[PDB]
From a paper:
This degradation pathway requires the cofactor NUB1, yet the underlying mechanisms remain unknown.
Furthermore, we revealed that FAT10 binding induces an open NUB1 conformation, in which the NUB1 UBL domain is undocked from the trap domain and, thus, available to specifically interact with the T2 site of the proteasome Rpn1 receptor subunit for FAT10 delivery. Similar to the deubiquitinase Usp14, whose UBL domain binds the T2 site in a slightly varied position, the NUB1 UBL domain uses a hydrophobic center (M154 and L156) that is flanked by charged residues to interact with Rpn1. NUB1 uses its UBL domain to interact with the Rpn1 T2 site, similar to the deubiquitinase Usp14, yet it lacks additional persisting contacts to further stabilize the NUB1–FAT10 complex.
Numbering used by the authors:
A (entry chain U): 828 to 838
B (entry chain A): 39 to 66
C (entry chain g): 79 to 173
D (entry chain f): 155 to 172, 182 to 355, 367 to 620, 645 to 908
E (entry chain B): 43 to 84
The structure:
């Protein structure tokens, strides 16, 4: 589908 | 309360994700 | 000094003595002699203990010098439930 | 206006990410110190990334709150803010002369030079004694210099040479010196082969661990020792060293009788027992290196099997150059089987855990390259990456080059090694990105899917850092067990055991009990062993009842019955006085040795059919590396026991709310020589004594309070 | 209570960065759970 954007990778 | 809006948004996202998890996994 | 090495002997705690004892000796004496000396001065049975010297085992047949001992090296004394020669015998009986 | 300045600080933090700002923060922070709103000030410097001058504006009455808040935020923030937060909190502690809690943060940082500087800077000999106690519990040893005052006592405390005597003093105090036969655990009279003998040997070792007395082996044990057959006869002798754990003088006395055996299995089991006996305690004369060194290159592979594992357990978490140089050539030896190579990898990883040793990494990589693909199909090859992974345990981004070195390796062993080392590098970090990668690995269904079990185990190995990730990983493990492939779900019980070892929480025990009687034999064995591991050393009555019911159910299945007996032995480990949890100091310090041992057992359990149930059950003795006592001793200035009244109860989070909130709830008052369950804190009931360290775990030193009896 | 939907108790109750980080960790694990379940169902 699509890699879920976690809080850490949000940068 | 500088994080009040961030905490509220994260809590709403948590509740929505939990509801989606329950819907996908069944448990009813 | 003058061919005197003070081995740092570590006795078992069951013998309630000083944990670390200095013991001066010469270096060309054989392992059996060293075993007998630590047996007599610290009061243990000569054939009922084992010496761990310089992170290795004490070679009774070989002299101390060829084992690589030196100054201020440590020797731990381990007591034995059975002596080194009759333990093999009774274990051979236990076959 | 408080609200106006709060909004101004929030706006300043917002625009910083996008000269007078420094003045604004230098005025706002002292205000928040004044009006007891410390955490808002901490958030300000956290946002604008100037936690450096926060230290200068701390008073004596608020250092504890700011320090606790800063430390509690580290588990949830990524690098490089972890190091900055730890160093700032450590500097604040050091400025206030709170040396033990500064050494705790230094140990968290894994900065050896900083730890040595903190230890040396302190002038109070008693504080140095307590800090040496914490270092000995953590497995960290400092080579102090001779001019340092009280060298002998400090080194003795750090080397844990007095651990056995103190543990026996506990056992006499709690009148639990009486040995327990495995029949007392089985309770077969209430119930309405070499395998069972081996299981009973393991139970006998587990229950009487570190006690030094036994009704079954300290007697004429040759009858019981020969009652086992073949490789089980390996482990029973090794179990004799488990009863004498931490007793490197008496234990080696009781093992030396078996060193003269003409039987190879007993001789190498006794060598492993010698290694086990020296585990934890750091003797100056190196007896384990004296007894087991001559058998690392022996013709018999069993001789090597016992010796290498014993040397690894004895010198685990030591990074000793001599032991590593003695053990490395064993890998490349032609006569060394793949079993011996794997056990050498485990031992070298345990010795140099978390040290990123260059020689160990190079040798393990070379050994992996030299092995052919058909050789790599062997499951004991799985121990080669683990020893590599243990080499970089918790190091994080230090494995990328290693990862590159692993690219040439053929598949599916390349994927297994990559996942194992990637997991070990981020052990106890809670990195949600790494757990996301592991879940991506576990998502693809498929021999080919060997690394999926390692990924499942690594989810727990990363989420074990803190409780939020732990419970979230419990939910994730439930999903994996529901949707996973059989190879995927054979590791979920192992992950559950790893994430809650010695913590018998009801939900995990129920989850494991549901899958204990499962159709797949391997998941059943893993679930039963995880029931044992989760309640290991807890003496849980309910868990014992479940295990007895399972023994009734699995009576006709030798493998399941063996696993049930193993779980029963683990549940009563050390007669309830030992814990396998790798986290101490209020579950904030991760013991690399304990993690290494738990990994050695659990990764090997990924092939429980051939390793644990086969000829390699001795790997269970890796749990010895994780065996620590759930301790609370109060010592006087001269280290003599000091019975004091303490309140023990479930730990309660204090961060946030102001005042002096109670840190425990539902507590009871006991004299100090008491055992602390997982998650249980203890506080001095009276004010007669002041502890040297805030954490009342392990060995604690108390000083007379001048204010008391004023 | 609600069984599967017991989430961990975040601390402290007062709004701050630490509570935000804990709640974001819970959200991250829930997001990973959602991705894993959506991948396994299909």
């Amino acid at each position: 589908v699509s890699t879920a954007v976690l809080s850490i990778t949000a940068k | 309360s500088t994080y009040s809006r961030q905490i509220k948004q994260v809590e709403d996202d948590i509740q929505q994700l939990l509801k989606k998890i329950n819907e996908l996994t069944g448990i009813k | 000094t003058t061919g005197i090495a003070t081995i740092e002997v570590f006795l078992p705690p069951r013998l309630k003595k000083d944990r670390k004892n200095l013991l001066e000796t010469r270096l060309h004496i054989t392992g059996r002699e060293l075993r007998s000396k630590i047996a007599e001065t610290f009061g243990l049975q000569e054939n009922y203990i084992k010496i761990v010297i310089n992170k290795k085992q004490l070679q009774l047949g070989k002299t101390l010098e060829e084992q690589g001992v030196a100054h201020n090296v440590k020797a731990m004394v381990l007591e034995l439930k059975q002596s080194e020669e009759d333990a093999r015998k009774n274990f051979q009986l236990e076959e | 206006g408080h609200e106006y300045v709060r909004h101004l600080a929030g706006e300043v933090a917002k625009e910083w990410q996008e000269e007078p700002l420094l003045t604004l923060v230098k005025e706002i922070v002292p205000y928040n110190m004044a009006h007891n709103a410390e955490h808002e000030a901490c958030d300000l410097l956290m946002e604008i990334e100037q936690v450096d001058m926060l230290e200068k504006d701390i008073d004596e009455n608020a250092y504890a709150k700011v320090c606790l808040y800063l430390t509690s935020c580290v588990n949830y923030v990524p690098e490089p803010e972890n190091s900055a937060l730890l160093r700032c909190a450590l500097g604040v502690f050091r400025k206030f002369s709170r040396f033990p809690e500064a050494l705790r943060l230094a140990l968290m940082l894994n900065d050896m030079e900083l730890v040595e500087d903190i230890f040396t800077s302190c002038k109070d000999v008693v504080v140095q004694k307590q800090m040496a106690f914490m270092l000995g519990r953590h497995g960290v040893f400092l080579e102090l210099s001779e001019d340092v005052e009280e060298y002998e006592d400090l080194t003795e405390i750090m080397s844990n040479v007095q651990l056995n005597s103190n543990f026996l003093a506990l056992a006499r105090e709690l009148d639990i010196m009486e040995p327990k036969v495995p029949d007392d655990i089985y309770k077969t009279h209430l119930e309405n082969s070499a395998r069972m003998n081996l299981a009973s040997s393991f139970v006998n070792g587990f229950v009487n661990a570190a006690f030094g007395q036994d009704k079954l082996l300290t007697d004429d044990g040759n009858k019981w020792l020969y009652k086992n057959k073949d490789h089980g006869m390996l482990s029973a002798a090794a179990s004799l060293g488990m009863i004498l754990l931490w007793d490197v003088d008496g234990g080696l006395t009781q093992i030396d009788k078996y060193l003269y055996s003409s039987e190879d299995y007993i001789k190498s089991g006794a060598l492993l027992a010698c290694g086990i006996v020296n585990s934890g305690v750091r003797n100056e004369c190196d007896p384990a290196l004296a007894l087991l060194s001559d058998y690392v290159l022996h013709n018999s592979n069993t001789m090597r099997l016992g010796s290498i594992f014993g040397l690894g357990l004895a010198y685990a978490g030591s990074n000793r150059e001599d032991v590593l140089t003695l053990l490395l050539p064993v890998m490349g030896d032609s006569k060394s089987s793949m079993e011996v190579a794997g056990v050498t990898a485990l031992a070298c990883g345990m010795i140099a855990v978390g040290s990123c040793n260059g020689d160990v990494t190079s040798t393990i990589l070379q050994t992996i390259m030299e092995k052919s693909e058909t050789e790599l199909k062997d499951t004991y090859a799985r121990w080669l990456p683990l020893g590599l992974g243990l080499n970089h345990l918790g190091k994080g981004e230090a494995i990328e080059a290693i990862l590159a070195a692993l690219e040439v390796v053929s598949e599916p062993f390349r994927s297994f090694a990559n996942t194992l080392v990637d997991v070990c590098a981020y052990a106890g970090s809670g990195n949600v990105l790494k757990v996301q990668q592991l879940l991506h690995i576990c998502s693809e269904h498929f021999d080919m899917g060997a690394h999926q079990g390692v990924a499942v185990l690594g989810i727990a190995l990363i989420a074990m850092g803190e409780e939020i990730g732990a419970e979230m990983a419990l939910r994730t493990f439930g999903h994996l067990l529901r949707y996973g492939e059989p190879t995927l779900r054979r590791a979920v019980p192992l992950a559950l055991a790893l994430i809650s070892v010695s913590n018998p929480r009801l939900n995990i025990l129920d989850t494991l009990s549901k899958f204990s009687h499962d159709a797949d034999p391997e998941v059943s064995y893993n679930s039963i062993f995880a029931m044992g591991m989760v309640g290991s050393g807890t003496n849980n009555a309910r868990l014992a009842a479940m295990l007895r019911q399972l023994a009734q159910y699995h009576a006709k299945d030798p493998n399941n019955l063996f696993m049930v007996r193993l779980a029963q032995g683990l549940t009563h480990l050390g007669k309830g006085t030992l814990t396998l949890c790798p986290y101490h100091s209020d579950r904030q310090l991760m013991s690399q040795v304990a993690v290494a041992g738990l990994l050695t057992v659990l990764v090997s359990f990924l092939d429980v059919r051939n390793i644990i149930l086969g000829k390699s059950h001795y790997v269970l003795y890796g749990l010895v590396a994780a065996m620590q006592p759930r301790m609370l001793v109060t010592f006087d200035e001269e280290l003599r026991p000091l019975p004091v009244s303490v309140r023990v109860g479930q730990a309660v989070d204090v961060v946030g709310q102001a005042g002096k909130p109670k840190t425990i709830t539902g507590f009871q008052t006991h004299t100090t020589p008491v055992l602390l369950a997982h998650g249980e804190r203890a506080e001095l009931a009276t004010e007669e004594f002041l502890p040297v360290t805030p954490i009342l775990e392990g060995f604690v030193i108390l000083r007379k309070n001048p204010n008391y009896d004023l | 209570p609600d069984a599967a939907s017991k989430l961990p108790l975040v601390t402290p109750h007062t709004q701050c960065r630490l509570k935000l980080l804990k709640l974001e960790r819970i959200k991250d694990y829930l997001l990973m759970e959602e991705e894993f379940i959506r991948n396994q169902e299909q």
